[PDB]
Amino acid sequence: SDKLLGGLLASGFDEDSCLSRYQSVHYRKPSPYKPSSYLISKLRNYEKLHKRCGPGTESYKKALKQLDQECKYVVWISFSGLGNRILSLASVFLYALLTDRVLLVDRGKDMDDLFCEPFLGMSWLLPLDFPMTDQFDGLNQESSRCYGYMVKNQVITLSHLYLHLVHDYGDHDKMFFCEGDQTFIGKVPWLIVKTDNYFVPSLWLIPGFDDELNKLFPQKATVFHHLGRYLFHPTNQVWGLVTRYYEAYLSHADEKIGIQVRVFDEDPGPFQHVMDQISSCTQKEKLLPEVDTLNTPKHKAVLVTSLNAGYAENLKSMYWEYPTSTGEIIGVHQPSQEGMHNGKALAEMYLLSLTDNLVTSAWSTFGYVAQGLGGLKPWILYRPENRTTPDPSCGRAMSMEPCFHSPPFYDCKAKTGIDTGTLVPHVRHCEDISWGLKLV
Ligand SMILES: Nc1nc2c(ncn2[C@@H]2O[C@H](COP(=O)(O)OP(=O)(O)O)[C@@H](O)[C@H]2O)c(=O)[nH]1
């Protein structure tokens, strides 16, 4: 039932310690995407595993002694910007599900300040004494237990491997995405991953993983919408930022439009070419109305997020200064202008996720997280060139999924390059960044 997201969440968490977990319902349209029964059982079974093998259990103490050389593990290193961390952690989780491993999370500076516990009865956090923690900063493509390094140097009983899956990775790190190397990695009890990518799409190209993924996800472009909603619930101090903003500014409207504005440029602007992009997109797509210089009205709330407030200022000044062609009543709202940090950034992604129709910015993982949690197939503001308003200014995404920006392009069987975006109908080149891949 609705608190549990059609069965995706388990009941029995203590409510006061993570209010947001089951108070989604009061702020959110129910999602039209039903998790499959298979997936539900995958998630209930994972909780069982994570309980038996989790941090602090006897089995975890037993498995830990294998670091000097019936439970296996993958560890995520807190690394990169928040949006990356969300995506990448979700990917690692899917990985864990596909390899019968326990997920442990490096809490970094902030992870448990931002997210509640997602696994009933046992913490997902990596213990603070974990032997290898001090190495995490230093782990890279040239480390001795780097899988890519070992393959390159043709080395090959491993108790642990580092898996370098950062965007800068290479031909050898990429072999992670091949069946045969998966077969070998399969036997290693401790995996340590550093990554900044939503690498989910290339898992669908790995035989055996394909069959399971088809079953878990009959609707293939719901991977981040289900797993993201399962894993990420914001803590009480983040959720207060959401509820307070939503209550004060947002909850009167017949309709909500999200506009997620990321401008990848070392000058904060604001830029007139992007202002014009945003008013062309919202108008040409009938997301917001035109204004004039000469039923009964709906109220639309425009939620703008950006580092700079100039975009929201413009929209605000336009709908203030001029009547709408439609008679519609438009209000424009932006929460911050950042130029608690991480907490505001998360809240804003969750407030985006609450909108009825979302505009995103090309290449931005902030937009990916918001679209995904909300189950929103967005309109993507294309990445400009030469400070000119792209024409067309935006277009509808193929699907609500996040883009894998740095995928491998290798046919593991033939052992030769290949464009892995043109192999199956459900894995395609991204709308924003044509190099990448996403599920459709
Ligand atoms: N609060 C807030 N922070 C933002 C916004 N846009 C960018 N940021 C900050 O800059 C970071 C951008 O990195 P990331 O989250 O990985 O997303 P990306 O760089 O757009 O792909 C965000 O996490 C925020 O800390 C915004 O609209 N609101």
Scored b (16 or more CB within 10 A) or e, 73-97 reads bbbbbbbbebbbbbbbbbbbbbbbb
Q: Which two tokens stand for residue 185?
A: 């990695």
Domain ranges of the chain: 1-440
Closest CA to 420 of 431, 408, 412: 408
Q: Compute the distance between CA of residue 186 and CA of residue 196 in angstroms, rounded to an integer.
A: 22
- Best residue among 197, 366, 433 to mutate for probing ligand 1, ranked by most atoms within 8 Å of CB: 366
Q: How many CA atoms lie within 13 A of 74 on its CB side?
A: 24
Nearest CA to ligand 1 atom 13: 81
Q: Do residues 101 and 182 make contact, with C-beta atoms less than 8 angstroms apart?
A: no
Which secondary-structure segment (H or E) carries 305?
strand 299-305
Q: Which amino acid is at 75?
A: V
305 lines ligand 1 (CB under 6 A): yes
Q: Do residues 438 and 424 make contact, with C-beta atoms less than 8 angstroms apart?
A: no
Q: Compute the distance between CA of residue 218 and CA of residue 358 in angstroms, rounded to an integer.
A: 24
110 lines ligand 1 (CB under 6 A): no
Q: Which two tokens stand for residue 25?
A: 């319902």
Nearest CA to ligand 1 atom 1: 345
20 lines ligand 1 (CB under 6 A): no
Evaluate the omega torsion of the peptide bond into residue 270 and state whether it is cis, within 30 degrees of 0: yes
Q: Compute the distance between CA of residue 21 and CA of residue 41 in angstroms, rounded to an integer.
A: 19
106 lines ligand 1 (CB under 6 A): no
Q: Compute the distance between CA of residue 299 and CA of residue 254 in angstroms, rounded to an integer.
A: 5
Q: Which amino acid is at 187?
A: K
Scored b (16 or more CB within 10 A) or e, 363-385 reads bbbbbbbbbbbbbbebbbbbebe
Which secondary-structure segment (H or E) carries 313?
helix 310-321
Q: Do residues 228 and 369 make contact, with C-beta atoms less than 8 angstroms apart?
A: yes
Which secondary-structure segment (H or E) carries 43?
helix 37-53
Close Cβ partners of 198 (under 8 Å, ≥ 6 residues apart): 87, 88, 90, 91, 224, 365, 368, 402, 403, 404, 405
Strand partners, 350: none
Close Cβ partners of 223 (under 8 Å, ≥ 6 residues apart): 94, 200, 213, 217, 401, 439
Which secondary-structure segment (H or E) carries 428?
strand 427-429
361 lines ligand 1 (CB under 6 A): no
